[PDB]
Amino acid sequence: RRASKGRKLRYTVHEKLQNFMAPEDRRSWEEHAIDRLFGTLFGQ
Amino acid sequence: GISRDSRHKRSHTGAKRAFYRKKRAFELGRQPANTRIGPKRIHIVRTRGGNHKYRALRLDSGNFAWGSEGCTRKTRIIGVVYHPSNNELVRTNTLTKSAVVQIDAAPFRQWYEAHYGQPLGRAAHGKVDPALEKQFEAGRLYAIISSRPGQSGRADGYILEGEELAFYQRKLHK
Amino acid sequence: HQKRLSAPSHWLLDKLSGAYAPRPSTGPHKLRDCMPLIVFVRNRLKYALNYRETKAIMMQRLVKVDGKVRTDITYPAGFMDVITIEKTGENFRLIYDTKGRFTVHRITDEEAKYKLGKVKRVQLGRGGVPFLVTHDARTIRYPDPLIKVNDTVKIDLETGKITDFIKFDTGALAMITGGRNMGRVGVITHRERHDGGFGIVHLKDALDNTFATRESNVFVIGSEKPWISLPK
Amino acid sequence: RAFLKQPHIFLNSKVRRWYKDVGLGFKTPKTAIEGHYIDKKCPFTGMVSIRGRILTGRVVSTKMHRTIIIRREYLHYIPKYNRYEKRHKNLAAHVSPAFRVEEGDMVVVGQCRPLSKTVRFNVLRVLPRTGKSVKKFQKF
Amino acid sequence: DIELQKLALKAILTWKSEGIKPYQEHLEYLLDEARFKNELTVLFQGDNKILPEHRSEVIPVLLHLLYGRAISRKGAASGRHGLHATRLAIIRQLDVEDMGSFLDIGLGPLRAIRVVDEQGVRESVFAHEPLPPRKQVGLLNMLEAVINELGTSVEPYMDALVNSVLYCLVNACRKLNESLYRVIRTTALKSLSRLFQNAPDFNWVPYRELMVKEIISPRIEKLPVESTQGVSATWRLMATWSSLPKAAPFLNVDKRILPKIVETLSIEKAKDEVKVFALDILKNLINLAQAPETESQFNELIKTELLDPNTDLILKTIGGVLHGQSDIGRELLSSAVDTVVVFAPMIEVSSHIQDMLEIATWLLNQPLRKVNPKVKGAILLILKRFIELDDLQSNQELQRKVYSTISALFGFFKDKQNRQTLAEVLDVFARREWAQEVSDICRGLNSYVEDYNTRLAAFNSITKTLDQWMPLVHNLLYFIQQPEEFGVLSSNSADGLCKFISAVESVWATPDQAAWIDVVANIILPAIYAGSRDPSETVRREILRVFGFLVSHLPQWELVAVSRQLQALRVLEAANDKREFRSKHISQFFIPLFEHFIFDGLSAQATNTIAALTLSLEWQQYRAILRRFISYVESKPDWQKRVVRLLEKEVDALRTAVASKK
RNA sequence: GUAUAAGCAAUUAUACAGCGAAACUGCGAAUGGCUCAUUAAAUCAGUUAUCGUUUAUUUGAUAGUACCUUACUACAUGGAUAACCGUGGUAAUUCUAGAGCUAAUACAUGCUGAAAAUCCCGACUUCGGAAGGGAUGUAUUUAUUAGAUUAAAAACCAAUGCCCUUCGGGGCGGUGAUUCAUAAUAACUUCUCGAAUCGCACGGCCUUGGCCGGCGAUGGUUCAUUCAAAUUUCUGCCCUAUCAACUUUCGACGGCUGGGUAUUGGCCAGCCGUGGUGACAACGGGUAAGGGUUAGGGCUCGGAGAAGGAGCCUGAGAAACGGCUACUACAUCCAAGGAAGGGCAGGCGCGCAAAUUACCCAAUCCCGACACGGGGAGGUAGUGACAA
After folding, report:
1. D91 CB contacts (<8 Å, ≥6 apart)?
2. What GO cellular component entries does it have (chain C) (predicted)?
3. Does E354 touch chain B (CB under 8 A)?
4. Do residues B57 and B93 lie in contact, with contact meaning Cβ atoms separated by under 8 Å?
5. Nearest residue (Cα to C1') for F320?
6. Angle at E614 (CA atoms; ends E610, E620), nearest 5 degrees
7. How far apart are alpha carbons B54 and E50 in whole angstroms?
8. What's the CA gap between B109 and B113, in Å, rounded?
């Protein structure tokens, strides 16, 4: 194949790259406003 | 991290060998230098035997040879137009070897009108290819870089002319 | 700092020079093809006894090699380098023998005044001038225009001027300086080109023994004309 | 890609083609002389020079860009059998577009500076025969 | 002085001005002695160019600083890269109005000088020196660089430049302390030459005595003896003078200049380069003398004053050159024959055309080693333009000699235009004179050179008298040697040669016998051998036909189908053994024929005939033959068995030969 | 090479002179050696190449490069620091602060006595020596040209000839190869070198004011040579098919283009092509990791780490473990603010056991400004009923 050197996304788990950071949820909004805004974007 | 040894690649028969040794000093290959356009920035690197080689990182001027008539001049460099290796390099305006780039034409036109006499770009020995004449009328020629800016510290090369000139016009249009 | 046994067996040391042996310093002659000055003084000539004695003798301007005073102890003097000692007024020259060992010869000033050196190569130096490289690492500027590779030159040793030359020739007598038949004085009778590396010559003696030595090891001494006094 | 060129011959002049002989009793072919093909690893067009060992062999896989694979057969003496045994060796050599490649022919190659991990030789003179496939065995 | 420069620039920046304000970094970086070239090339052709608004406010201080950096001797290294490349760089990057203000700065006292007045010379100016010669050397080198970088933009600055350089040149020649004035004179003439071919449109007429004082006084009485070595700057000035149209009539002012030029050409101990240089001066003179209206504004004088009173000396000297020494370089030869080509239509009457025609036929019978065939074509054009003067009726022995040459050139040339010019020189040959006979030759060669239907008509018409015949013989054997278009030209030329040899055997009166017999020998027999070595098989067939005609019609002359081929070869064996042969006949006709027969039982019959003929021939020819055969062995690996069978048979013949001669 | 030590030791013409601590400058420490998970033709050994690269030291030669508008000029070159003297801080040793000096072979610039200098040509010539004509280094990098008798090479080659004669005769740079070596022009470099150095003798011309004058030491551009180092070509491992498929899973095989490397190279980045290896034994597995010197035995030669990862520094040669930098794991001093640091050898290892904590670089050998300084190889010595 033409693609060995990273050219295709090898969906393979990485050992050292496994558990770096825990998700810290930092969002000041109660998510109802945000997805109601995603509804009421330009399109509606 | 960077080295030139061939231990890590596979065998000629397609085998993998451990061959575990340490990276010594004579397989050292230094980090690349994206020579870009700017004021003159050159870092000196001493190498084996105490030789000096000049890694040029930011370059403005180089010299170019219009040796068809037998002249060469130090001119500025506007910006790369095409490069055979990497379109990312063409984007990031890098100067390497064999790099076609538009250069300023003013010293060449000065030398032409001084030597032969007729104005150009505004007898029978002073004759120009018409594509080169169009380059002169625009005032920004197509030249090539053939000096290694990384391992020589200078952007020098010959002007494009004739068959290579038209080939590179067609390549630019591609 | 090699051992006495691992030292080359053609500059001789007896069974009492200790387990060690000097290594030659860097100089004109090669490492394997060298005789150092201390070994020439105190092991072959025995004009001294000890390293300190040889140090003192070489420190005062008393030993002259190839017309120039040599200071340091282990200056290499490999092959056909005249060694003038003025307090004895003798001149010694280094040849080989039939077995392949260093042999010292005594000479007076008339034959001691000149050297015979094999030409390594010839090129054009800086400025567009031809220069000539001997095997003694001597460079002669402005040579005779006929002296090619593997020629031999009689050298003045006082002005370094090219006094004479001898040509590589089939039908000439030679001396061997390498190979398994090293040190067998005889006549060149045949040359074989073998274009592609390692040309050979076929060299017989004066007494009907043929053998194959390579041109690099061949060292032209003279057609008959033994310009240096070989030992009788 | 860029425009290919011999390194220092001035083309666009308003007023040639350089090719050197390797020597060793070889003759440059006419396609190398006049054929406008250009390549850096050709000993008659590029700057590669040939020196050292000169070898022969028979091509097996010509299906490659200007590089052939050569089966080197020889007779291996094993002491346990006190007998000669056939052993094939797989080389490579940079093939010039000057010659007419034939599969199964007899080709003379020459040692050069290392052009690739495997490519260490240049072809000099092919000899056209009727060599067959893998099933043919012969010392060469 | 760089420290005084730094303090001066600090003072100018103390003059706080909005004009100098955006450029102070460029000024200090131009002034810092480690940033000069980079600061220059960032000043000019950079992003921050000089704005044209306050350009009149910044340019004077910048130009004085540029003069300081171009005058500095401290930091400069040696060589041209030492300070000469610096001056060239500054002047190349400068501009022309800036150059005018700069040369105002450069010419200190000599800015307002007048070298020429309403009268001719200003001796009151020249007998007073305002400058030391060191500053004059600097000024003059500076101005040479200025002119060399300026080119055609010199036009608004002539009224200062010519005054400066002429004052320097005339003070130098009056000083003719020697080294300074010498280098002054040489670089002065160099700048003058560049100035001349830069500015043609200037009026140079208001001073003539200046060129007089520069040229005639010190040199002309010695000029060949001096210029025997190489070209000079005076020679360059005269060359560009002859190149320019309006500058050429300055050579009339002293009338001995062109005589002494061809006297340099007369001295045969020159390095040949001054010879071809004076020759190119004459080239430009003649091209000017032929040129249209733009040069016919001066042609009538240069016809009537420069070339006319010296054509005799020109041709006498060129003859002394072409008959003085046995060694002439090919460049000098081609260039001399080119000058006489261009001089030919420029003269109408002279005195030495006898000598000219003799030298023409001399250089035409010169061998091909000394003279190239292109050069022989040039002498042919010379012959056409030089024969038409009324001279040939006197001294007929010269005239039968030159006609022998033109005939000889008919089988030599290869080029159609050369053969057209041959037919033309034959045309004017007939126009000069015998006349109707040579006009018959004119129409013959005209319909020879004209295409293929006309050529075959020519062959048949002449198929339907010695000097009539000889050129037809020459072009006839040339059209033998032409192999084939359809082969018809070869066959018709063969038929014509049979007709000629029939005329030959027809006429047998004893002085006609002698003349025609020497002619047919010395032109036909070597042509037979050359066509024998010719590998064209149609040529060999027709040469066998004409050789059969020769041997069958001649025989009183003292020197004379596989199955049928082999039978005829056996007949030839029997002819050998009944009569051995003539040795030259063997060695130069028969051997190459069966050599061709081999390399194209035929081979066995061929080598048997070669065996018998190697018996028949002479040993010295045999020695060369055997060396050629072993050379065939070494060089031709195509027929190993064939050549070695030839070797076996020929040395068996040698063994029988020594056995018989025992 | 640098001495004004406020250091000694003196005088018979007084800058210095003999010895000379400290200090600056130059060299040196790519090993002598220690430990331990191992390396199964990749190392290694023969055998080649470097026309693909580097090299301090070695020895040999070596460099013609002026003038060129400063001129109403310039003509014994600059500035810093150390050692030193004095003022201190802290618990903390050059951990060091402030102040006052002075030298260089340390760091650095460097037109000038002059109307010439130096190369090439050389006509005329009394070997006369020359009238007068052209021209102004090196290193880097690029471009171009030459790198060699003509290219209308239609030459030379058939000298098989031509001409005389007595007919006997006579006359007519290197390589196997390279764009190699080398030379020349255009410019280019924030680019070098082209001796502002030291010791010793001291002689010729006599403008008695100097002008010339030798031997060395140190230094410097190029090219050799040496010592090396780097890759690199054909052959050669022990055993096994309960190892027949392997590689493309760090590109696997090409070619082109560049980057970096001292240089070649999928060594790496783009672009496209389709491979390459294998029953002649690939690949895997096992770990038990010799060559040459030929009567013989003897003799000689033969990966990873310095508490742990990671990065950097000097130098001709190191990824030195010598240093530093941050993280981690330890440990020490303290006035609790802070500071420096990491190895080997010996004894016990039951409560009961057993070969020196020896001497010198004396010889061989090594490293230095260097005859003199310094060497953990080397020899000398002591113990022994294990034997013999």
Report:
1. D55, D57, D69, D70, D72, D109, D118, D120, D121
2. cytosolic small ribosomal subunit
3. no
4. no
5. B25
6. 140
7. 32
8. 6
Amino acid identity of residue D8, one-letter, is H
126-155 of E, contacting B, C-beta below 8 A: 148-153
Q: Which helix (H) or strand (E) holds C44?
A: none
Helices (H) and strands (E) in chain B, counts: 5, 8
Cα B23 to Cα B2: distance, rounded to the nearest angstrom: 9
**Considering only CB atoms, which residues of chain B are within 8 Å of chain D?**
6, 9, 12, 67-68, 84, 98, 127, 161-165, 167-168
- DSSP letter for A17, please: T
Contact E214, E169 (CB under 8 A): yes
Q: How was this structure determined?
A: cryo-EM
Dihedral pair phi/psi, residue D90, rounded to 5°: -110, 105
The candidate with the shortest Cα–Cα distance to E21, out of E65, E66, E51, is E51
User: Among all residues of chain B, which has the CA nearest to that of D4?
Assistant: B164
Q: Show Cβ contacts of residue D31 under 8 Å, excluding neighbours closer than 6 positions.
A: D37, D97, D98, D99
- Would an 8 Å CB–CB cutoff place E565 in contact with chain B? no
Closest CA to C200 of C189, C208, C186, C184: C189
Count other C-beta atoms under 10 Å from residue E42's C-beta: 21
CB-CB under 8 Å, B117 with E198: yes
The answer for residues whose C-beta is within 8 angstroms of residue C165's C-beta and 6 or more apart is C144, C146, C147, C151, C152, C153, C154
Residues in C closer than 8 angstroms to D51, CB to CB, are 197
Q: How far apart are CA E593 and CA C7, in angstroms?
A: 76
Q: How far is CA B101 from CA B110, B130, B165, in A?
A: 20, 19, 12
Tokens of E437: 């006979």
Residue E499 DSSP one-character state: H
CA pair distance D84, D78, nearest whole angstrom: 6
Following CA atoms E253, E254, E256, E259 in sequence, which dihedral angle do they give, to the nearest 10 degrees?
A: -40
The candidate with the shortest Cα–Cα distance to B103, out of B57, B47, B64, B46, is B64
Q: At residue E496, what is the residue type?
A: G
Q: What is the DSSP string of E204-260?
A: -TT-SHHHHHHHTTTTTTTHHHHTTS---HHHHHHHHHHHSTTTGGGGSSSTTHHHH
Helix (H, G, I), strand (E, B) or coil at D128: coil
Q: How many whole angstroms separate alpha carbon C182 and alpha carbon C175?
A: 8
CB hemisphere CA count around D105 (13 angstroms): 16
- Note whether E611 and E649 are within 8 A (CB): yes
Q: Give the distance between the most distant pair of CA atoms in chain C.
A: 55
Integer angstrom CA distances of residue D11 from B40, B68, B70, D8: 33, 9, 14, 9
Distances (CA, A) of E407 to C216, E281, E383, E394, E480: 65, 35, 13, 21, 16
| CB–CB contact D10 B12 (8 Å) | no
- Distant-in-sequence contacts of E90-98, Cβ < 8 A, 24+ apart: E90/E40, E90/E66, E91/E145, E91/E146, E91/E149, E91/E150, E92/B73, E92/B107, E92/B110, E92/B111, E92/E149, E93/B107, E93/E40, E93/E41, E93/E44, E93/E45, E94/E66, E94/E149, E96/E150, E96/E153, E96/E156, E98/E59, E98/E63
Q: How many CB pairs under 8 A join C and D?
A: 7
Q: Which of D136, D134, D115, D122 has the alpha carbon at shortest distance from D22? A: D122
Tokens of residue E543, six digits: 């040469």
Cα–Cα dist C208/C210, whole Å: 6
Sign for the pseudo-dihedral over CA of D125, D131, D135, D136: negative
Stated as kind and residue range, the H or E segment containing C190 is: strand C186-192
Amino acid identity for residue D53 in this structure: R
- Mapping DSSP to helix (H, G, I), strand (E, B) and coil, where does residue E173 land? helix
- What letter does residue E556 receive in the DSSP assignment? T
Q: Specify whether the CB–CB gap between E246 and E298 falls below 8 A.
A: yes
Gap from B12 CA to chain D (nearest CA, Å): 7
